[PDB]
Ligand binder design. Structure first.
Ligand SMILES: [Ca+2]
Length: 226
């Protein structure tokens, strides 16, 4: 029931730019890809433009585009993310790594021309030099998670909560608690949803012809009502 639904009927080019500071280690990541919300499909490649990434790539996956979720027709009235477009929304997160530090992210997600842009500032603090994050003990993979969206009618936005389980290379799990807030950038109306969730599956790979520190990401995202 929004104008934003119509900007995503096709393949949309995607740009991501991130400035990061984790425990004084500063770093930048650029990403390009393609989005096809008809099939909740994202294809992305990310490159650390400042050298080697001081954290594990799986820890950045959630930070690096839920407006490409596929909402089923009987649920399109609950798609906040597209309803904010093209002016966009601000996405903020606190990500609490269990027994370790935490990321704090602020992201502006909007269209620039025909290109969907994710611009992200990230600051991580209180990480243990030899935890699973700074000591790079996380496996290069990703499990499937459900994200629970809730309307936040007082801020004209949504609240989302979920837990990621990073596999550690000894077989254990490193827990990342995500606390997320989205807010429209514009004045216009947005779709405030009933409670629902996004089902996400991600696949991480390498580009065989790339020598810079990088991550290829494939992600499918479908909404699911209750
Ligand atoms: Ca309702």
């Amino acid at each position: 029931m929004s104008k934003g639904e119509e900007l995503f009927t096709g393949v949309v080019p995607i740009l991501v730019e991130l400035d990061g500071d984790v425990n004084g280690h500063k770093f930048s990541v650029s990403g390009e890809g393609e989005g096809d919300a008809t099939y909740g499909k994202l294809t992305l490649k990310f490159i650390c433009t400042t050298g080697k990434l001081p954290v594990p790539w799986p820890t950045l996956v959630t930070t690096f585009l839920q407006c490409f979720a596929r909402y089923p027709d009987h649920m399109k009235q609950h798609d906040f993310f597209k309803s904010a477009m093209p002016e966009g929304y601000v996405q903020e997160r606190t990500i609490f790594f269990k027994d370790d530090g935490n990321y704090k992210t602020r992201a502006e997600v909007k269209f620039e021309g025909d290109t969907l842009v994710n611009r992200i500032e990230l600051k991580g603090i209180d990480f243990k030099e030899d935890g699973n994050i700074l000591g790079h003990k996380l496996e290069y993979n990703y499990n499937s998670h459900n994200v629970y969206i809730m309307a936040d009618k007082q801020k004209n936005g949504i609240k989302v909560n979920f837990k990621i389980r990073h596999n550690i290379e000894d077989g254990s799990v490193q827990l990342a608690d995500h606390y997320q807030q989205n807010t429209p950038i514009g004045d216009g109306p947005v779709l405030l949803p009933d409670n629902h969730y996004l089902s996400t599956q991600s696949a991480l790979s390498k580009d065989p012809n790339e020598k810079r520190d990088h991550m290829v990401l494939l992600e499918f995202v479908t909404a699911a009502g209750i």
